[PDB]
Write a protein that holds these residues in place. Structure first.
Motif, PDB file in Angstrom:
ATOM      1  N   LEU B  48     -37.221  27.778  37.682  1.00  0.00           N
ATOM      2  CA  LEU B  48     -37.987  28.914  38.104  1.00  0.00           C
ATOM      3  C   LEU B  48     -36.925  29.896  38.617  1.00  0.00           C
ATOM      4  O   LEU B  48     -36.097  29.546  39.464  1.00  0.00           O
ATOM      5  CB  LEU B  48     -38.885  28.533  39.295  1.00  0.00           C
ATOM      6  N   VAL B  49     -36.938  31.118  38.105  1.00  0.00           N
ATOM      7  CA  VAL B  49     -35.946  32.105  38.479  1.00  0.00           C
ATOM      8  C   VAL B  49     -36.673  33.292  39.074  1.00  0.00           C
ATOM      9  O   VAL B  49     -37.561  33.843  38.405  1.00  0.00           O
ATOM     10  CB  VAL B  49     -35.124  32.579  37.243  1.00  0.00           C
ATOM     11  N   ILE B  50     -36.329  33.653  40.317  1.00  0.00           N
ATOM     12  CA  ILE B  50     -36.855  34.845  40.926  1.00  0.00           C
ATOM     13  C   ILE B  50     -35.680  35.832  40.889  1.00  0.00           C
ATOM     14  O   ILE B  50     -34.698  35.702  41.641  1.00  0.00           O
ATOM     15  CB  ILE B  50     -37.362  34.610  42.428  1.00  0.00           C
ATOM     16  N   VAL B  51     -35.779  36.866  40.062  1.00  0.00           N
ATOM     17  CA  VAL B  51     -34.625  37.767  39.817  1.00  0.00           C
ATOM     18  C   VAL B  51     -35.087  39.231  39.772  1.00  0.00           C
ATOM     19  O   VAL B  51     -36.114  39.582  39.157  1.00  0.00           O
ATOM     20  CB  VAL B  51     -33.821  37.363  38.434  1.00  0.00           C
ATOM     21  N   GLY B  52     -34.288  40.121  40.369  1.00  0.00           N
ATOM     22  CA  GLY B  52     -34.634  41.532  40.284  1.00  0.00           C
ATOM     23  C   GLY B  52     -34.072  42.175  41.529  1.00  0.00           C
ATOM     24  O   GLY B  52     -33.268  41.556  42.258  1.00  0.00           O
ATOM     25  N   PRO B  53     -34.391  43.429  41.715  1.00  0.00           N
ATOM     26  CA  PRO B  53     -33.755  44.211  42.776  1.00  0.00           C
ATOM     27  C   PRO B  53     -33.920  43.635  44.142  1.00  0.00           C
ATOM     28  O   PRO B  53     -34.919  42.949  44.401  1.00  0.00           O
ATOM     29  CB  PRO B  53     -34.512  45.555  42.687  1.00  0.00           C
ATOM     30  N   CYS B  54     -32.974  43.910  45.040  1.00  0.00           N
ATOM     31  CA  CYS B  54     -33.230  43.565  46.428  1.00  0.00           C
ATOM     32  C   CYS B  54     -34.549  44.224  46.926  1.00  0.00           C
ATOM     33  O   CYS B  54     -35.344  43.628  47.666  1.00  0.00           O
ATOM     34  CB  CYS B  54     -32.064  44.089  47.291  1.00  0.00           C
ATOM     35  N   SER B  55     -34.733  45.495  46.580  1.00  0.00           N
ATOM     36  CA  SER B  55     -35.969  46.201  46.881  1.00  0.00           C
ATOM     37  C   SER B  55     -36.319  47.172  45.754  1.00  0.00           C
ATOM     38  O   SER B  55     -35.452  47.565  44.974  1.00  0.00           O
ATOM     39  CB  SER B  55     -35.773  47.013  48.161  1.00  0.00           C
ATOM     40  N   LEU B  72     -35.692  39.487  27.846  1.00  0.00           N
ATOM     41  CA  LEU B  72     -34.812  38.350  27.998  1.00  0.00           C
ATOM     42  C   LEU B  72     -35.624  37.090  28.336  1.00  0.00           C
ATOM     43  O   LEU B  72     -35.267  35.951  27.953  1.00  0.00           O
ATOM     44  CB  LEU B  72     -33.791  38.662  29.103  1.00  0.00           C
ATOM     45  N   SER B  73     -36.739  37.299  29.034  1.00  0.00           N
ATOM     46  CA  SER B  73     -37.560  36.201  29.488  1.00  0.00           C
ATOM     47  C   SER B  73     -38.238  35.581  28.254  1.00  0.00           C
ATOM     48  O   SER B  73     -38.323  34.365  28.138  1.00  0.00           O
ATOM     49  CB  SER B  73     -38.577  36.740  30.502  1.00  0.00           C
ATOM     50  N   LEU B  80     -36.299  28.776  31.016  1.00  0.00           N
ATOM     51  CA  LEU B  80     -36.419  29.505  32.305  1.00  0.00           C
ATOM     52  C   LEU B  80     -37.838  30.083  32.482  1.00  0.00           C
ATOM     53  O   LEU B  80     -38.381  30.662  31.575  1.00  0.00           O
ATOM     54  CB  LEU B  80     -35.391  30.664  32.387  1.00  0.00           C
ATOM     55  N   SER B  81     -38.421  29.904  33.657  1.00  0.00           N
ATOM     56  CA  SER B  81     -39.678  30.556  33.956  1.00  0.00           C
ATOM     57  C   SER B  81     -39.281  31.703  34.847  1.00  0.00           C
ATOM     58  O   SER B  81     -38.810  31.508  35.982  1.00  0.00           O
ATOM     59  CB  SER B  81     -40.703  29.673  34.668  1.00  0.00           C
ATOM     60  N   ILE B  82     -39.438  32.910  34.328  1.00  0.00           N
ATOM     61  CA  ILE B  82     -38.909  34.094  35.057  1.00  0.00           C
ATOM     62  C   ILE B  82     -39.968  34.919  35.825  1.00  0.00           C
ATOM     63  O   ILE B  82     -41.016  35.276  35.282  1.00  0.00           O
ATOM     64  CB  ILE B  82     -38.032  34.974  34.100  1.00  0.00           C
ATOM     65  N   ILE B  83     -39.684  35.242  37.099  1.00  0.00           N
ATOM     66  CA  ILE B  83     -40.611  36.081  37.903  1.00  0.00           C
ATOM     67  C   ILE B  83     -39.717  37.196  38.427  1.00  0.00           C
ATOM     68  O   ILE B  83     -38.607  36.919  38.894  1.00  0.00           O
ATOM     69  CB  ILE B  83     -41.274  35.266  39.084  1.00  0.00           C
ATOM     70  N   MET B  84     -40.179  38.445  38.340  1.00  0.00           N
ATOM     71  CA  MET B  84     -39.393  39.564  38.802  1.00  0.00           C
ATOM     72  C   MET B  84     -39.478  39.675  40.314  1.00  0.00           C
ATOM     73  O   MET B  84     -40.578  39.650  40.838  1.00  0.00           O
ATOM     74  CB  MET B  84     -39.924  40.893  38.246  1.00  0.00           C
ATOM     75  N   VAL B 335     -29.888  24.242  31.828  1.00  0.00           N
ATOM     76  CA  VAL B 335     -31.182  23.590  31.751  1.00  0.00           C
ATOM     77  C   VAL B 335     -31.250  22.744  30.499  1.00  0.00           C
ATOM     78  O   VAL B 335     -31.695  21.599  30.506  1.00  0.00           O
ATOM     79  CB  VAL B 335     -32.350  24.658  31.807  1.00  0.00           C
ATOM     80  N   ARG B 336     -30.779  23.316  29.402  1.00  0.00           N
ATOM     81  CA  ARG B 336     -30.731  22.545  28.150  1.00  0.00           C
ATOM     82  C   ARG B 336     -29.847  21.296  28.282  1.00  0.00           C
ATOM     83  O   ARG B 336     -30.239  20.216  27.862  1.00  0.00           O
ATOM     84  CB  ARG B 336     -30.249  23.418  27.012  1.00  0.00           C
ATOM     85  N   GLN B 337     -28.668  21.436  28.874  1.00  0.00           N
ATOM     86  CA  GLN B 337     -27.799  20.302  29.039  1.00  0.00           C
ATOM     87  C   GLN B 337     -28.471  19.267  29.971  1.00  0.00           C
ATOM     88  O   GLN B 337     -28.331  18.033  29.783  1.00  0.00           O
ATOM     89  CB  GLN B 337     -26.383  20.725  29.483  1.00  0.00           C
TER      90      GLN B 337
END
Ligand SMILES: [Mn+2]
Ligand SMILES: [Mn+2]
Lengths: 339, 343
Positions: B48-55, B72-73, B80-84, B335-337
């Protein structure tokens, strides 16, 4: 999906008319504020003492304790300005009884309307005998129900870092002490006093019980409370010296909590901390302007007996007398030194 | 006495009618919750990836960023499960801009009603393109305006100890990550997950904007986020081990924040932390189920003078988009490895 439901809540305005403050209550609360201000801002050379039970679970015992503390307060008033700890809200490490407002029956039924009514009746009862009170401001909504009676607010070690609490403090009509963080360092309490002294804009609940946008003016009467923590106790001279070194210009005087981290898990240490704090004050330390003591009718604590705390262990009434009479003596000695 | 005044506030229910969620927004928020749940509770072996601007200070630049992340998601969704990160509320050390709700014009006018409109409109915009969002739940009132759109909430390092925030989390309908304390230790986050797992009863504001007594059911989807602090960074295998040793039975997987305390004052450290976390994951570390990354269109940050540079953070320094893509592709590879090790 994770709300079980919402139950109606009396508004702060309604509760205020249902449980009116007396004229003596209002005067007492105003007097406690002025005296607290004068001490932490260095206008008065007395020490501000916030002393009493860790928590209030029993109004009648609180009244007995208050009557004793009011008498002793009258004895020691040339030297100490005493406010009773009447704490309604208790921050838990994880879960546990949260205090009088949350669950007044202390049996997990959570009758918050009754808790608010009991809290207000308690605050009226205590201030109506001419004894000022203070409480930890944990909930940001409950002070609307009770502030008119309050002379001192604490922000607890676990919330001093919280922006919502710095916001709250910036709008409270009375002095506010920020406890140092639970790691035992002061920086977060120093930061919190800086933040609270500024005007804030945030959503808050009004006296008619609806959310609105509040603009506060900033609270210049915030100060640090030294309460120990993981890095160690901090009531000694080195700790005080280190604290004074981190205080900005404009800072108010320091308060030392004898209990919590500074007691090292043994309430019987509070009188030992007193001795060490007395020696500094007596020998000329003017930066120490306040102390905080967990005190009750009877000593110790109990698990969930009259006049015995159900949260942290407290010193008993007789030890309380000896501690405060010693502190008063130290205040008089500091006055000599300062001539 | 220290109250300058009160200004009227639109109710959550009113704003929700005014700025309705689209069916795509809603399904997007629900899917983001499902996937995050399945990852933190060990049902799914993606991270689970939480990615994006600080604000978020700029809706249009957030939208451009969201489109690149959603692309990309879609490419990396097997791993990867991506959340902005769409963070609306910023805790300050002392004072400073508190984010889009509090002062959407970033000029000290504090038009909170417009801030809550901008925030909600932003949340519908991002989730309407199929990208789930997360935010720090700093305000205990604002989530009534927005929670229908939210797939992840963070409780920040400075509020993880706060009983009010633990109470809040216990009634939120999405997973909640509690950051470790600013001193770098994790006991307070572990205690927070325990507290927030219980029902609480507290005063709160309802959708009609009035205060009432709330009873929550307890939130079983809370997890610790490792974000470093005074004691040092804590993304390495020994810290991780030490973290796993403190987790009670029933605990969810850990998340590692590459930024803040783990990047030691330098956003350029985020890929270095990625490398160390990837080595752990690729080698069989299953308790690491999530990561968080401060990422923007362009790298670094800038002061607030509008005269702002496009796609650059006005709060913490971020890695730029290009670095982000490299980091995330490397994380997917790990993750794949890890899947190979697990067979
Ligand atoms: Mn206590
Ligand atoms: Mn940040």
């Amino acid at each position: 999906v994770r709300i079980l439901g919402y139950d109606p809540l009396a508004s702060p305005a309604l509760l205020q008319v249902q449980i009116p403050a007396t004229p003596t209550s209002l005067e007492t609360a105003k007097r406690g504020r002025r005296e607290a201000i004068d001490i932490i801002t260095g206008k008065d050379d007395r020490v501000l003492v916030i002393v009493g039970p860790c928590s209030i679970h029993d109004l009648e015992a609180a009244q007995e304790y208050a009557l004793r503390l009011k008498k002793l307060s009258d004895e020691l008033k040339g030297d100490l300005s005493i406010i009773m700890r009447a704490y309604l809200e208790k921050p838990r490490t994880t879960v546990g009884w949260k205090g009088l407002i949350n669950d007044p029956d202390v049996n997990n039924t959570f009758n918050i309307n009754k808790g608010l009514q009991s809290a207000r009746q308690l605050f009226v009862n205590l201030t109506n005998i001419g004894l000022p009170i203070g409480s930890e401001m944990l909930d940001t909504i409950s002070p609307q129900y009770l502030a008119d009676l309050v002379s001192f607010g604490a922000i607890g070690a676990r919330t001093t870092e919280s922006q919502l609490h710095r916001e709250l403090a910036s709008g409270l009509s009375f002095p506010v002490g920020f406890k140092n963080g639970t790691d035992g360092t002061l920086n977060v309490a120093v930061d919190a006093c800086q933040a609270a002294a500024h005007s804030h804009h945030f959503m808050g609940v009004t006296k008619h019980g609806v959310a609105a946008i509040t603009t506060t003016k900033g609270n210049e009467h915030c100060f640090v409370i030294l309460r120990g923590g993981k890095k160690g106790t901090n009531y000694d001279a080195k700790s005080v010296a280190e604290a004074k070194a981190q205080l900005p210009a404009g800072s108010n005087g320091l308060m030392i909590d004898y209990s919590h981290g500074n007691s090292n898990k043994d309430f019987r240490n509070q009188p030992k901390v007193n001795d060490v704090v007395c020696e500094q004050i007596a020998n000329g330390e003017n930066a120490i302007t306040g102390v905080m003591i967990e005190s009750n009718i009877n000593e110790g604590n109990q698990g969930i007996k009259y006049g015995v705390s159900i949260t942290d262990a407290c010193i008993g009434w007789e030890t309380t007398e000896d501690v405060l009479r010693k502190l008063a003596a130290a205040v008089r000695q500091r006055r000599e030194v300062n001539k």
